[PDB]
Design an enzyme around this catalytic site. Structure first.
Site, PDB file in Angstrom:
ATOM      1  N   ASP C  53      -4.677  79.543   8.273  1.00 31.94           N
ATOM      2  CA  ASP C  53      -4.826  78.118   8.537  1.00 31.94           C
ATOM      3  C   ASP C  53      -5.714  77.482   7.469  1.00 31.94           C
ATOM      4  O   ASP C  53      -6.874  77.862   7.303  1.00 31.94           O
ATOM      5  CB  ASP C  53      -5.427  77.905   9.931  1.00 31.94           C
ATOM      6  CG  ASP C  53      -5.513  76.441  10.312  1.00 31.94           C
ATOM      7  OD1 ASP C  53      -4.723  75.636   9.777  1.00 31.94           O
ATOM      8  OD2 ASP C  53      -6.365  76.094  11.159  1.00 31.94           O
ATOM      9  N   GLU C 198       1.417  72.951  29.919  1.00 36.79           N
ATOM     10  CA  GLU C 198       1.920  71.619  29.603  1.00 36.79           C
ATOM     11  C   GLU C 198       3.344  71.717  29.065  1.00 36.79           C
ATOM     12  O   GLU C 198       3.645  72.581  28.242  1.00 36.79           O
ATOM     13  CB  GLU C 198       1.018  70.934  28.573  1.00 36.79           C
ATOM     14  CG  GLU C 198      -0.298  70.421  29.144  1.00 36.79           C
ATOM     15  CD  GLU C 198      -1.078  69.583  28.150  1.00 36.79           C
ATOM     16  OE1 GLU C 198      -0.444  68.938  27.289  1.00 36.79           O
ATOM     17  OE2 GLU C 198      -2.324  69.561  28.236  1.00 36.79           O
ATOM     18  N   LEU C 269     -11.121  75.939  31.289  1.00 37.42           N
ATOM     19  CA  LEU C 269     -11.412  74.858  30.356  1.00 37.42           C
ATOM     20  C   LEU C 269     -12.920  74.720  30.200  1.00 37.42           C
ATOM     21  O   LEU C 269     -13.662  74.787  31.181  1.00 37.42           O
ATOM     22  CB  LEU C 269     -10.842  73.535  30.872  1.00 37.42           C
ATOM     23  CG  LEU C 269     -11.241  72.281  30.088  1.00 37.42           C
ATOM     24  CD1 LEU C 269     -10.241  72.030  28.972  1.00 37.42           C
ATOM     25  CD2 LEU C 269     -11.292  71.087  31.024  1.00 37.42           C
ATOM     26  N   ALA C 271     -16.242  72.426  28.687  1.00 35.84           N
ATOM     27  CA  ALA C 271     -16.629  71.055  28.375  1.00 35.84           C
ATOM     28  C   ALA C 271     -16.275  70.724  26.930  1.00 35.84           C
ATOM     29  O   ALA C 271     -15.345  69.960  26.669  1.00 35.84           O
ATOM     30  CB  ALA C 271     -18.122  70.870  28.604  1.00 35.84           C
ATOM     31  N   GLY C 272     -17.020  71.304  25.995  1.00 34.34           N
ATOM     32  CA  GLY C 272     -16.758  71.071  24.586  1.00 34.34           C
ATOM     33  C   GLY C 272     -16.067  72.280  23.988  1.00 34.34           C
ATOM     34  O   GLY C 272     -15.785  73.244  24.701  1.00 34.34           O
TER      35      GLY C 272
END
Ligand SMILES: [Zn+2]
Ligand SMILES: [Zn+2]
Lengths: 304, 291, 304, 304
Positions: C53, C198, C269, C271-272
């Site tokens: 990447d 999703e 999940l 927070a940041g």
């Protein structure tokens, strides 16, 4: 270049003799001639003359019935005749292969059931159809394997060997062997073409030879029958005959300039067609020694 | 086929040693055309090449030249790729060529063009150039030889230093700026193709000959592995030597300082310096004329 | 199927660990996680985490500069990182080959210049571009050789041997070897996919897995980060969060029914974004032992 | 003369590197050293280290199996190793020719089957047997042709041309070409000799060099390993070691006075034998930069 087939008629190494000539140019004749000349010159070797012409030209040329079963022509114990039917679009070469592979099965079959073995076979190619088309596929597809084999060698063989030149070797082995079936040695195989001094014939001849050269098949013999040489025959006259040869002489010069290093044997024209073992041998003698219209005029007006 | 080709080749060179040039040429081509018509390129190539060799050896430029062109045609028709074998045939033929052959340049061009189309070299195969260069030089085509040698091999570099050295010697009235006109060519040309090795070797060989013939006042300056033959009567040569090393550093500052100290030279080699400043110093700004 | 990567994190045989997931689905994260979990579980083996990447995700994930030269992440003497640029249409497979072959040269180069050898490499696949396309050409072209080799066996091998099964054997040898570079043993190589609950993600995931299955490349691990589990967090409320998870729960069920025998590890999940070796190891612990939003809620609201 | 092999290690023109030294004087070591130094200094060129020693010294020096098939030493993509058996009285030169001709067939064979081409080959000459004896026959027999060709020119060539200088020209052509195979350019070929500061070694060295000079083969490099320099090592003492070096210093002076214009690189003695790519490169560094027993003492007591 001697305008004769001596070197071939006396060759004991050759074992594959091709004979082509589209255009009813006396192919059948030349075939029986070349076969007889070799059989008589080498009585210590068995010869086989095979045809695929549906007209049974060999049976009408000798005067006896010849079938799929090889039979010695009456009077000779060195020559044999074979008349088989080579038949009774996506991939090139296949069809031709099947056709030739079948004719060879008819050969080995006649060498087991009496005959034992023929040292040199005289192939009387069919009148039509390029029965030698498969004489290029084997080299074709193979070379493609080489482009395939090599390229398939991504950077390396460092990493190609860590995840797995046997390929670059076996390819070259399957390569030669293949090319050895087409090349089939010029000293072992050759192709004899037949024609006459006439426009259309030359056209047919020129292409035929190109086709063979693309097959890498040795070709250095061009037979030209029906020649007049009407300027020597003892009994001149007849404008009709002189005019025709003036035209044949025209093209004959194009043949001697087109095929300079080729064995262009010029055969004489005979009154009627030559049939019967006898009249054939006496006419085939000119394939060993050049025909001289000044002296050999007798032998011709004899077959008449 | 293989036994037939060999044979005829003798009856051909037999017509050549007999005088029958027309016969030998006409026959061979028609026969060769036949092989080409059947796509039997390989056969035609050996036949044609061999025929061209004999003709050239017999001082028959006419036929020889013609056959070379014909060979090249097949080369492009058979898409013959540039490699040792392919190049070798041409090299062997170039050797028998007469330096005065009215077609020389054309022959050379054709061969090189082929090498360009079937190789990764934008200007042709290096080795091939080495041969071509020598041939051009034999016909007094110096400028053409220089280019090829410049884009040749290590031997070419030697023959390029000899070409420039034999030229400098040919000058009757030698001067301080004369030796530079020749020497500079080595430094600039090799620096363009970025061949520092050849630039340094060609320099050493040329500067040493110059010292053993003219006996100029000098003194070798050595610093951190590098050496600069400081000539007391040839400033042009000193500047040029520094220019070489400078490019090797690829440092803008050094390039600017060297030019600012030699303002005169900076205007004599205006265009040349502009290029070097773009290839070794990433300078887009044109070269401001000092004078 | 345990919803974890335990069996893989504790595997000492695996030497090729793939990690893909297009869609900015936290690929970089999962990669560093799987690499750390394996390095810590097997301190007796050298691991290498490499990415392609252009965003230098590994250098932004750990907090240190990583280049083409493999460097041990500070604090660990078992894990190493590598960030190379895999670049600095006629024949399929070629292009892909060149790309991968180049990355492997960068591997062996870093195993000689200190590092010596990495037992298992963690491939952080690129964000875009099917860098695994060449994972099918080798089997493809090869099978074509088999159709080529066999067919090239006209009637015989009776007559094919008289004019000339080394071909049918060497082919099968070049065949297996090749198929051994793609198959590369499921116990030696595997592929880990990453996504989220999703629509678009599932679409991307479904195809990715199909692509790998066509490469016969083992695949049985699907990472799904950013999960809410907002029905257990000690500090309920916030409809906004509850509504979002109601949607994530919808698809998650499609994932548990689509990939029934797959290792579908559901990650929580945060927070940041998780960065720094520390916050990474503490988050990667859930890849070994399932995450329980009822008890592990602390560890999450901790990374915040 | 710099007591190092720098000029050679950084040479991109040389394509024939000889390495001899009879007497178990560490020939194998120097060979691998010179090969590694050149491969690392010129990564833009492929090198090939080949040996004929039946003890498989290259496989025991690097730590990997090397056969008749050239293989890149693990960790280097510029250096390759080759271990072949140069064997598996009336006319001089013949026997030697056959031996060398065979080794070169093994070279071109490994350049076709992956490896493509090696710019410079490092010949690890055999321990015994003057494998370079044929390096004089070609010039010998040829010159005899010249005495033959000329003398065969009885009074003339006035009358010699009436009954019959192509002979005096083709001779000189076959002359140069031949002399070009032995001379093989000093900028293209060279010979590196290895030995130690010991009576017998010097005897063997002195003769070896004479032999090569009779072959017109360039020789200007003499390696001397096992040197003590026991007057600088930080940890003096040990009379046994000091006495041995007092003897080595004696001969070393005979070497510096015998070969004044030769590249006499004095290598340090290591505790144990140097094996493994790693310990080899670190020891070969002294072939590029002189070894200083005052500062480089660490690098040595390190290989221990
Ligand atoms: Zn919310
Ligand atoms: Zn001691």
């Amino acid at each position: 270049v001697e305008p004769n087939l001596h070197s071939l008629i006396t060759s004991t190494t050759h074992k594959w003799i091709f004979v082509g000539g589209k255009g009813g140019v006396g192919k059948t004749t030349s075939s029986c001639s070349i076969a007889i000349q070799m059989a008589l010159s080498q009585p210590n070797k068995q010869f086989l003359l095979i045809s695929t012409d549906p007209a049974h030209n060999l049976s009408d040329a000798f005067g006896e019935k010849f079938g799929k079963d090889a039979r010695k022509v009456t009077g000779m114990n060195n020559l044999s005749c074979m008349e088989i039917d080579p038949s009774a679009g996506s991939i090139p070469g296949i069809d031709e292969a099947l056709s030739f592979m079948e004719v060879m099965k008819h050969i080995k079959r006649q060498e087991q059931g009496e005959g034992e073995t023929f040292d040199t076979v005289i192939f009387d190619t069919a009148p039509t159809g390029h029965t030698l088309r498969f004489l290029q596929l084997p080299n074709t597809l193979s070379k493609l394997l080489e482009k395939f084999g090599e390229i398939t060698n991504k950077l390396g063989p460092m990493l190609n060997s860590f995840m797995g030149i046997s390929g670059k070797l076996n390819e070259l082995k399957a390569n030669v062997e293949t090319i050895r079936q087409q090349f089939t040695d010029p000293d072992l195989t050759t192709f004899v073409c037949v024609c006459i001094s006439e426009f259309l014939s030359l056209y047919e001849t020129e292409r035929l030879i190109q086709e063979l050269i693309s097959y890498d098949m040795d070709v250095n013999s061009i037979i030209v029958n029906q020649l007049l040489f009407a300027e020597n025959d003892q009994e001149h006259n007849c404008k009709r005959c002189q005019a025709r040869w003036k035209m044949q002489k025209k093209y004959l010069d194009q043949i001697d300039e087109l095929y300079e290093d080729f064995h262009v044997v010029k055969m004489p024209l005979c009154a009627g067609e030559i049939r019967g073992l006898n009249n054939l041998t006496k006419f085939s003698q000119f394939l060993n020694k050049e025909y001289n219209p000044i002296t050999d005029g007798k032998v011709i007006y004899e077959l008449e | 086929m293989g036994a037939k080709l060999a044979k005829t080749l003798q009856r051909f060179e037999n017509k050549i040693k007999a005088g029958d040039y027309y016969e030998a040429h006409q026959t061979l081509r028609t026969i060769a055309n036949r092989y080409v018509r059947s796509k039997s390129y390989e056969h035609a190539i050996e036949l044609i090449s061999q025929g061209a060799l004999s003709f050239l050896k017999a001082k028959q430029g006419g036929s020889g030249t013609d056959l070379i062109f014909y060979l090249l045609e097949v080369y492009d028709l058979a898409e013959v790729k540039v490699d040792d074998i392919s190049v070798a045939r041409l090299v062997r033929l170039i050797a028998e060529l007469d330096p005065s052959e009215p077609n020389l340049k054309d022959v050379i061009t054709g061969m090189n063009n082929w090498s360009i189309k079937f190789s990764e070299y934008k200007f042709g195969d290096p080795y091939l150039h080495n041969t071509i260069g020598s041939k051009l030089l034999e016909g007094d085509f110096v400028y053409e030889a220089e280019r090829y040698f410049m884009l040749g091999t290590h031997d070419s570099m030697i023959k390029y230093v000899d070409l420039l050295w034999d030229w400098l010697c040919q000058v009757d009235d030698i001067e301080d700026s004369t030796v530079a006109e020749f020497f500079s060519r080595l430094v600039f040309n090799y620096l363009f193709i970025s061949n520092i090795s050849f630039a340094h070797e060609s320099k050493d060989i040329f500067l040493e000959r110059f010292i053993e013939k003219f006996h100029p006042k000098y003194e070798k300056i050595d610093k951190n592995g590098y050496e600069i033959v400081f000539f007391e009567d040839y400033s042009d040569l000193n500047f040029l030597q520094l220019l070489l090393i400078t490019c090797q550093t690829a440092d803008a500052s050094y390039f600017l300082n060297l030019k600012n100290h030699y303002l005169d030279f900076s205007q004599a080699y205006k265009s040349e310096l502009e290029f070097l400043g773009q290839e070794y110093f990433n300078i887009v700004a044109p070269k401001q004329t000092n004078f």
